[PDB]
Amino acid sequence: QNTFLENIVRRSNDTNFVLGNAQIVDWPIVYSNDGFCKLSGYHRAEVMQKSSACSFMYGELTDKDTVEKVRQTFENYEMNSFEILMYKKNRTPVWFFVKIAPIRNEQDKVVLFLCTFSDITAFKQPIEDDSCKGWGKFARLTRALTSSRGVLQQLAPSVQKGENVHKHSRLAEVLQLGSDILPQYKQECVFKTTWDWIILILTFYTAILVPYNVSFKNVAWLVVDSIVDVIFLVDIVLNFHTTFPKLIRMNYLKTWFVIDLLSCLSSLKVVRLLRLGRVARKLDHYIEYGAAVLVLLVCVFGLAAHWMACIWYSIGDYEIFDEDTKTIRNNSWLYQLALDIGTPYQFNKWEGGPSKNSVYISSLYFTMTSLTSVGFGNIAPSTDIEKIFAVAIMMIGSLLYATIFGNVTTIFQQMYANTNRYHEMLNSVRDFLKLYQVPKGLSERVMDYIVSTWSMSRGIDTEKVLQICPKDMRADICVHLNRKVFKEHPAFRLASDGCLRALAMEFQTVHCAPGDLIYHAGESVDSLCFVVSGSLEVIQDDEVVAILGKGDVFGDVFWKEATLAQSCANVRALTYCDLHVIKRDALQKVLEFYTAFSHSFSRNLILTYNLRKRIVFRKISDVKREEEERMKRPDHPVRRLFQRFRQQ
Amino acid sequence: QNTFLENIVRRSNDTNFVLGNAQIVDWPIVYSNDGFCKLSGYHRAEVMQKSSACSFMYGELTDKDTVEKVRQTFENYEMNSFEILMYKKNRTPVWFFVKIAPIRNEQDKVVLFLCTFSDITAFKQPIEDDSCKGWGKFARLTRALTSSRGVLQQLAPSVQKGENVHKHSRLAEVLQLGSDILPQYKQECVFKTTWDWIILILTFYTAILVPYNVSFKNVAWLVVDSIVDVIFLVDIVLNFHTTFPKLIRMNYLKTWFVIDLLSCLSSLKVVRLLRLGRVARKLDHYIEYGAAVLVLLVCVFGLAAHWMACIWYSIGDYEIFDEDTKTIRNNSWLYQLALDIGTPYQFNKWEGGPSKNSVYISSLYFTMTSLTSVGFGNIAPSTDIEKIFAVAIMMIGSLLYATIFGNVTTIFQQMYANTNRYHEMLNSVRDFLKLYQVPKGLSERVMDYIVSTWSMSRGIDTEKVLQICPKDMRADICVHLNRKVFKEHPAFRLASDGCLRALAMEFQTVHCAPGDLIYHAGESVDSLCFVVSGSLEVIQDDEVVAILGKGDVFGDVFWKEATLAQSCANVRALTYCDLHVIKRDALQKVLEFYTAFSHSFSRNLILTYNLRKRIVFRKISDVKREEEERMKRPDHPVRRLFQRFRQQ
């Protein structure tokens, strides 16, 4: 987007300016702000289309040498600055400081001119053609140079030598504005995706490995642990730096920085469990995707399984040796587990029982039985704290199983509604056709039409899709849709592009099935048709009169006739035909609007077949009958009727 | 709401009255009831806009002193009462008792007057200008004062001295009506939320603690128990008192009072279980909220878990010692539990086994295994009555789990349909654009438009939302929407507010994307546009002619021209532009209706750019070519065409 005006008016700070066209003779004004309207005393429409030299603002005391200096700076495309007595709408002699900056382009062309203004009346000299008094003209000069003296020469009324300080500072403000004349009238991440992916898999790593290291407590795991720490710190500084600079850093310190700092800095290793705060960055990224939330629920299901498995082992380990009496108590899932798999605990000391890998996967098996509502009961809780933990994990497993089932059911509901609406409309059409006892050929024809247009369109109301777009986008879409007419016919290559869009907005598109007829003989012809694909036959009295191929126009010339006629012939299709039709009313609307186009349209459009003009012909069977009639070789009430035919 | 008429007509009880404007000269009538229409013999329209002094009702025998007394009471705003012979539409001499009450305000202003009437013909004297007989005029007097004598002086025909009793009682009824002249023509809980919250958490408390105290049977718990009792009694008297006074008390005694009284008054502590009847007050309050019903189902799930856990312990305790033979029977979940955790039962007496806290949480673990369909089977039923209880609780747990799963699935279905409709329309648009092979730039443009308007609008058919509102509310919404025009332009600050609404109902609002053009050069200009935000360029022959900023009007003046023209220039947008457009047909409808406004509209509205008037200009490249043409330095069939240009 090109915010060429907004940057100038933001930098300007109550100073005023006009914009003129640098590439047009006499340099006409294309824009003037309200400050220039107030200082000039003119209105926007009255300012624009005048010269940006502001020759209408000149006067008898306006120096012509400054005028040709302005002309030279406009011709040479040169940043300059001048002061000149110019007049207003009330013809007051007002000295102006015009600063002219050419405007380059992305193509570096000198396309515009910027002329900024101020009032230098009080700064130089008061000169009046007539005034009430010297104080009155002086007061008018001070009131005119109000925003010059006021909001720029603030402390300058205390000091002397304002021409040496404050006027030079206003000229330097115009110089910094010329430094800000850079917008030049032109329009002015995958690393984040890959970074969020690798920190997501590392958050899965730490959510597996931290409760593992809490409960069950090499070297290369510590190496990759330090890699996890430094990559997390790099992610913190990237969450500082990257887009949504200092305002997003303050927003990050408000939002998430305390958790993300304490997450990755000896019991406080459980504080590392808060590293899943990074996962909420990706959770919004794939909540729109639906089938991946099933994968999200399965992943958090396994993650919570690993979590509460380590919690379950922690409960067993807290329970076996909770006292200094060192009793096994004959009651724990660890003790029943050691009696189950073998090697019960022994003492010589207290020699441990089961191996830690078997312990972890046995505990994960137990937590999976809990969260999956299976519940075998090999490992099954019998101590107090493990039982209240069992209640807790069963209440969590119910909700996790519910969320999985609801997500799967919603996935199936979308995947089934998208086909169920089509199957239901097909079933209702079959029900309707069976209701009214359509002859089976026509029922099959309408049915295979419905299946064909549902295979082609895939269930898209394309006209409604065009209603979703705005006006110009829909018109340009229609122009691309009717490129198959407009690039092909000589009738349309002389049209204006506005006429192209105002035509293309009226063109329906027909997908004729083979064997299906468009205009039956006797139907109203009200829409000339262009054939962009397929092959057509024209049947007059059971006889093929015209074969229409690609790029042919039939129907009836409306703009010459202005008369509705009957189709003198059937028009049937031979192949899958693509037609681009236009009714006569919209055609006549466009042709009445585009008057200079319509004559060239009449001269260029040659109908391949008039569907009004019945063509006279005889069959060869008829002249064979006439040749047979050599073997054969009152009229007064009827021949007068033939004389009425003579009167006809 | 100001039910100023309804209170008067309810209090009136067949007496009649008029209402007149107290702040308008001559005191015109604003209202007269049907009783006054019947007594006066006049119609409503014929009564209104006459004086409330009813000077048209006066006659030759009407006392002018009473007329100026009425005038003085109207001027001084004074409650008074008079009797006067006045005439009807058939000019009958009818004595009236007018009672005049001024009407104060919320601002205490004397805004209306109330004049109530009756017939005092028979009470004072019969005087006729002419009549058929004395009995006939007397009969007409009795028929006229029918509702006076009938429904007010009921037992007075038995007694004498009706002027001393019944007429004074009718005047006192008018005095009580003046006491009821108080409506004055003006418009005439968080404690319940917090109270229902604290009784809801106390119902959770009693639903946990009463089966606890039934099955497992300090002092501070008894203190807070008595607090529970007194707070429940205060809730009973608040359910008596508070809104939906005596009718809601009778409705409460019909509805819920028997249950709520027996709930909070030694086996009948189980009767305290009916205290959950208060919860049905909150159940209707949060059935509209959907995500909280998941919390409701989880809370009643845990509540039923605690319930049937206490029932399970009650079953075990009933089963261990059901006889006087004192057999342990080697079969109970309590006995298997005591053999599991340790300390089996012993006798010396019968020394108990497991501790009651372990017993309760073990039983709650069992009931959670039942209701969560996990079913480990540490505690697992083996006696008869515990098995039929197990069937009962499994049949309850199936339905509770089903309701949880259905509620979770509905929550996910709402949360997924709201994004799935947008993702499906986006997928169909991408499918349609890929179907017809749009050049990729235009496909990306329409796609980013769709995503931009779905980020801005968030999927709201705002026009349909305006269709939901009624007429005046939709008009006022449109006026607030077009405040960005109406507060800014000098064209609209002279309009009537009806003209403001009838204009604002026609203003579409366009959100122009940057780089997107509104009127292509050659398109029909039929809608003048106001620019309330953004920046626009006007391109005539690939050259910027006019930059349009905030508060500028383009298009074409329709009401002067009454002619449809072509756009002589493209009009493209530079920034995100907000336009408020109006087509020429609705504009011409409004301007034809608001005739006095349309002249000021024509005088005040200055077009920033006529899109009809093509502007003549030359390029500087062209005059550079002309300066080059110094190096270069039959017409008769064509120059006559130029002479035809002279003819043009």
Curated annotation (Swiss-Prot), chains A, B:
Q: Which domain of life is it from?
A: Eukaryota
Q: Which GO terms describe its biological process?
A: cellular response to calcium ion; monoatomic ion transmembrane transport; potassium ion transmembrane transport; potassium ion transport; regulation of cell population proliferation; regulation of membrane potential; regulation of presynaptic cytosolic calcium ion concentration; regulation of synaptic vesicle exocytosis
Region (Interaction with cyclic nucleotide-binding pocket) residue spans: 609-611
Activity regulation description: Channel activity is inhibited by interaction with Ca(2+)-bound calmodulin. Interaction of a single pore-forming alpha subunit with a calmodulin chain is sufficient to promote channel closure. Channel activity is not regulated by cyclic nucleotides. Channel activity is inhibited by binding intracellular phosphatidylinositol-3,5-bisphosphate and phosphatidylinositol-4,5-bisphosphate (PIP2), but is not inhibited by phosphatidylinositol 4-phosphate.
Intramembrane residue ranges = 359-380
Parts of the chain on the Extracellular side: 315-358, 381-387
Main subcellular localisation: membrane
What ranges are annotated Cytoplasmic (topological domains)? 1-195, 284-292
Stretches assigned to the PAC domain:
80-132
* Listed GO CC annotations: axolemma; axon; cell surface; dendrite; early endosome membrane; neuronal cell body; nuclear inner membrane; parallel fiber to Purkinje cell synapse
Q: How does it sit in the membrane?
A: Multi-pass membrane protein
Q: Where is this region: Required for phosphatidylinositol bisphosphate binding?
A: 138-149
Residues spanning the membrane = 196-216, 220-240, 252-265, 266-283, 293-314, 388-408
Q: Where is the PAS domain?
A: 1-81
Give tissue specificity per the record: Detected in cerebellum, at parallel fiber synapses on Purkinje cell spines. Detected in hippocampus neurons (at protein level). Detected in brain, but not in the other tissues tested; expression is highest in granular cells of the dentate gyrus, in hippocampus CA3 pyramidal cells, and in cerebellar granule cells. Detected in pituitary.
What's the record's remark on domains?
The segment S4 is probably the voltage-sensor and is characterized by a series of positively charged amino acids at every third position. Conformational changes of voltage-sensor are driven by an electric field generated by a potassium gradient across the membrane.
Quaternary state and partners of this protein? Homomultimer. The potassium channel is composed of a homo- or heterotetrameric complex of pore-forming alpha subunits that can associate with modulating beta subunits. Heteromultimer with KCNH5/EAG2. Interacts with ALG10B. Interacts with RABEP1. Interacts (via C-terminus) with CTTN. Interacts (via cytoplasmic region) with Ca(2+)-bound calmodulin.
Question: What protein am I looking at?
Answer: Voltage-gated delayed rectifier potassium channel KCNH1
Native species: Rattus norvegicus (Rat)
**Encoding gene per record:** Kcnh1
